[PDB]
Amino acid sequence: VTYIFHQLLDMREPVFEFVRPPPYHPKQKRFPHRQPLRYLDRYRDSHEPTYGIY
Amino acid sequence: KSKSKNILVRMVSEAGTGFCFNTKRNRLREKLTLLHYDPVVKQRVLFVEKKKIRSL
Amino acid sequence: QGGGARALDLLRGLPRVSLANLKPNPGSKKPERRPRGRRRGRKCGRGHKGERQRGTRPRLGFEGGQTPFYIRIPKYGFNEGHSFRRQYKPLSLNRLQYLIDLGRVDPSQPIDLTQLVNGRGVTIQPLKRDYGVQLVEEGADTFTAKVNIEVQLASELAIAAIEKNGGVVTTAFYDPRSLDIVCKPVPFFLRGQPIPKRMLPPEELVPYYTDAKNRGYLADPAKFPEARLELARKYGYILPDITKDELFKMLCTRKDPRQIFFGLAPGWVVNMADKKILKPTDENLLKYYTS
Amino acid sequence: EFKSIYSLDKLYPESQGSDTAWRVPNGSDIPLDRLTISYCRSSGNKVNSKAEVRFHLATAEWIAEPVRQKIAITHKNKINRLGELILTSESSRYQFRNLADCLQKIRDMITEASQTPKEPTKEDVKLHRIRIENMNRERLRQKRIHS
Amino acid sequence: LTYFSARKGKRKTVKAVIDRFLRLHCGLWVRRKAGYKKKLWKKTPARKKRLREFVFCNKTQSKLLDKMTTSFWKRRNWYVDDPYQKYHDRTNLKV
RNA sequence: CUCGGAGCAGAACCCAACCUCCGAGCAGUACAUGCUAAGACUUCACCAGUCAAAGCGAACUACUAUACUCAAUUGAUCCAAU
Ligand SMILES: [K+]
Ligand SMILES: [K+]
Ligand SMILES: [K+]
Ligand SMILES: [Mg+2]
Ligand SMILES: [Mg+2]
Ligand SMILES: [Mg+2]
Ligand SMILES: [Mg+2]
Ligand SMILES: [Mg+2]
């Protein structure tokens, strides 16, 4: 099929991917009582340490 | 309280990993040898009863 | 310009400001409440009988006899040894670049804790088990300054950022006494004590500071060229030849492992009043301070 | 100048010299000049950034010709119409780490091609279904009555 | 609680608290589960996993523990390689 | 004097009496009753308790196989033993 796109149709080959809906999480609360420590990771964008103003 | 039937024993892995798990056995039966999953070696291995923990 | 000029010409036509016409700003003086009168008297907000009104309710944390929350939870060593844990104030490359751009830290001279503290770049608390500064990678993408900087800890990516721009980074240990002195030298000089020697790292930290990967100050200089080249390869930049730089001598300036300050040796007494330096000549003293 | 018993000269007498630690070793696998490195923001706004490294695989002379031909087959899905092998990493906030990831992928590609591993890898689940489907497609294949 | 000590006239910490709870700088308190080392032979795997979790306290308990500890225990610490470093700061928290 | 089922309490939940009845303080089979993790339930607080997709690792192409049958079948912290 790459030959058809590149040679016959004279175009770049379109590639597609099956994308799943983003996972659901309930609204984050200030005191997540009785939830495990990993609760906080569910609402974290990045995995690399942050240092704020410092 | 007086009644007594089973006992709790420590089953120790024969793989030398030191992994142990506790199981219940009848007091009047012979020492247990069981095939149980050992996380250290990550596959099922033989376990042999070593000590009685308590009376159940 | 309706503010400054309108507020002062309008004062010309008002009575003189005196001790008889002053008042606090509204909202700064909340009223005081007294147990007098119908509203606030009688039981005076204490309720009726019980321990409440009499002032004898149990201690904080007591739950009426039920095994309290703060006791029925099992003990666990979350905070075990907290007071003996080493701490390092983070210094980001963003903050370091910011300080250089504003003239608060001078990149033309070696940068150590003293210069960082004097520029009010970082605040170190030796009494709170701070052992110095840790250079963190935040801001590496936009860090452009060429510096010779001495820190206590440095991340691999932070080291790469310093050395891609042609700078030099070294990791240097300071014991608690030395750290206090190097951070606030003037208070130390007013004690009239000879400059002490900097102690060696504890045994558990000797591997860190004797390793070229961390640019340890006790590491073999012959191993630095390879370590510097590895980071250049890993992060896709060309290692500059700093030997050809005009600031090469400054970039190489490093403290002796027993030296707290550049140009000052252990056992010297600083006479600030007379702006002099006293050096001991006794052989036994010189052996002690040089060992 | 102050020198104590723990001076680097005394600790490492063989490594003396002001230039010892600052020399660049003369004796270079991936030439950065030959790579086109671009930086953008991945879905940014998403916190992580993106680094892209693209080079013309066939023209690249720093890769052995047999290695060039085996990479083109294995990673045909990463080669565009112009013939440039495009690698992208967006796993970090820092452009440095993203570029380092892309460069390591190039080094892994060359290593895998040269290794020529004959070890039988474990079949993935998606591949298992395709194997059955390919088997039945061959089973429907016919031959001409009169060839 | 000792609100004013006889020697310093200062508030004191209840050390029973320090031995059981971790305070994250954002205000959250972490604890272990009661009974997580008790009679494991009679408890199911799912229950035992629940008992091993490190969990957060509620608002009321957090307020209580804050009162039972002095300011020293609420400062921002920079321990080297702290396992809990990431959890000291909240992210994407609304209201 | 703790725990479970039923009536009072007829239909979401909850609901008392020195109210009316019956029970529990185990047993049996497994030895992956391994690990891990979305989202939820909750005995009116807390503590405790309960159910779980996906995933890893197993089992598996005969086993209503995947959080065992079972209603309750139970005991915090400190401390002790190891
Ligand atoms: K009143
Ligand atoms: K009233
Ligand atoms: K503790
Ligand atoms: Mg009256
Ligand atoms: Mg009265
Ligand atoms: Mg009363
Ligand atoms: Mg509830
Ligand atoms: Mg599943």
Pairing of strands B33-38, C276-278: unpaired
Distance E54 CA to ligand 8 centre (A): 24
The CA C51 to ligand 5 mean position distance, Å, reads 12
Q: How far is the CA of D101 from the centre of ligand 7 (A)?
A: 49
Give B5-56's CATH code, choosing from 1.10.3720.10, 3.90.870.10, 3.40.50.1980, 2.20.28.120. 2.20.28.120
Residue C1 to residue A31: CA distance in whole angstroms: 49
Evaluate whether D87 touches D107 at the Cβ level (below 8 Å): no
Helix (H) or strand (E) segment spanning residue A2: helix A2-3
Classify residue C58 by burial, with Cβ atoms within 10 Å: 0-12, 13-18, 19+. exposed
Which chain C residues have a beta carbon less than 8 Å from that of A50?
138
Residue in this structure with the two tokens 């309710």, named with its chain if needed: C57
Q: Does C239 touch chain D (CB under 8 A)?
A: yes
Domain CATH for D90: 3.30.160.20
Tell me which H or E stretch contains B11: strand B6-13
Edge-first strand listing for the sheet containing D49-56: D36-41, D49-56, D84-89
Token pair recorded at residue C282: 């006794």
Å from CA of C77 to ligand 3 middle = 4
Which of C92, C142, C157, C287 is the best residue to mutate to test the D interface, defined by the most D CB atoms within 10 Å of its own CB? C157
The answer to whether the beta carbons of residues C251 and C108 sit under 8 Å apart is no
* CA-based nearest distance C118→chain D, Å: 24
Secondary structure E strands in E1-95: 22-23, 29-31, 55-56
**What phi and psi, each to the nearest 5 degrees, are found at residue B42?**
60, 40
- Measured at the CA of A14, the angle between CA A13 and CA A18, to 5 degrees, comes to 145
Q: How far is D69 from chain C (nearest CA, A)?
A: 25
- Identify the CA nearest to B55 among candidates B12, B2, B18: B2
**How far is E35 from C74, CA to CA, in rounded Å?**
8
CA of C177 from ligand 3 middle (Å) equals 28
Q: Kindly give the pairing relationship between strand D49-56 and strand D84-89.
A: antiparallel
**Domain boundaries defined on chain C:** 84-291
Residue C14 DSSP code: S
Q: Residue B24 CA to chain centroid, in angstroms?
A: 8
Give residue E48's identity as a one-letter amino acid code. Answer: K
**What is the Cα Rg of chain B in Å?**
12
Rg (CA), chain E: 17
Rounded CA–C1' distance between C77 and F74, in angstroms:
30
Residue A54 near residue E88 (C-beta atoms within 8 A): no
Taking an 8 Å cut-off on Cβ atoms, the answer to whether B24 and E40 are in contact is: no
Cα–Cα distance for residue pair D18/C249, rounded to 1 Å: 9
Nearest Cβ partner for A36 among E55, E62, E93: E55
Query: Inter-chain contact C259–D2, Cβ cutoff 8 Å?
Result: yes
Q: Is A34 on the interface with E (CB under 8 A)?
A: yes
Question: How many other CB atoms are there within 10 angstroms of residue C245's CB atom?
Answer: 15
Distance CA E89, CA E24 (A): 8
As beta bridge partners, residue C176 has none
**Chosen from C63, C67, C69, C135 to mutate, greatest number of chain E CBs within 10 A:** C69
SS3 content of chain E, % helix, strand, coil (to 5): 35, 10, 60
Whole-angstrom Cα distance, residue A33 to residue E58? 5
What range defines the domain where residue D106 resides?
A: 29-115
Report the candidate in C131, C143, C147 with the shortest Cα–Cα distance to residue C209. C131
The method recorded for this entry reads cryo-EM
CB D49 within 8 A of CB D98: yes
What span, in angstroms and rounded, lies between the C-alpha atoms of A32 and E30?
11
Q: Flag if E79 and C87 touch (Cβ within 8 Å).
A: yes
Query: In this structure, what are the phi and psi dihedrals at residue B34, rounded to the nearest 5 degrees?
Result: -125, 150
Neighbours of E80 (CB within 10 A): 13
Contacts (Cβ under 8 Å, ≥6 apart) of B15:
B38, B40, B41, B45
Contact D6 C243 (CB under 8 A): no
Residue B49 three-state SS: strand
Task: Determine phi and psi for D21, rounding to 5 degrees.
Answer: -85, -10
User: CB neighbours (10 Å) of residue C251?
Assistant: 19
Residue C133: which H helix or E strand, with range?
strand C130-136
CA D1/CA C48 separation, integer angstroms:
81
CB burial of residue C256 (10 Å; 0-12, 13-18, 19+): buried
- Which residue, counting CA atoms, is nearest to the C1' of nucleotide F52? E46
Phi-psi region of C74 (alpha: psi -120 to 50; beta: other; left: phi over 0): beta
Confirm if C145 and C94 have CB atoms less than 8 A apart: no
Burial of B29 (0-12, 13-18, 19+ CB in 10 A): exposed
Do C113 and C133 touch, CB atoms closer than 8 A?
yes
Q: In C, which residues are within 8 Å of A33 by CB distance? A: none
d(CA C150, CA C217): 9
d(CA C66, CA C87): 40
Q: What DSSP line would sit under D33-97, residue for residue?
A: GG-EEEEEETT---S-EEEEEEEETTT-SSS-HHHHHHHHHHTGGGB-TTSEEEEEE-SSSSHHH
Pairs of residues, one from chain C and one from chain E, whose beta carbons lie less than 8 Å apart = 66
Closest chain D residue to A10, measured at CA: D81
> Rounded distance, CA D46 to CA A41, Å?
16
> What are chain D's partners, defined as 3 or more CB pairs within 8 angstroms?
A, C
Give backbone dihedrals phi and psi of D85, rounded to 5 degrees, phi first: -80, 120
E48 touches chain B (CB under 8 A): no
Domains of chain B, by residue range, sit at: 5-56
Q: Compute the Cα dihedral for C79, C80, C84, C88 and give only its sign.
A: negative
Does A45 contact D47 at a Cβ distance shorter than 8 Å?
yes
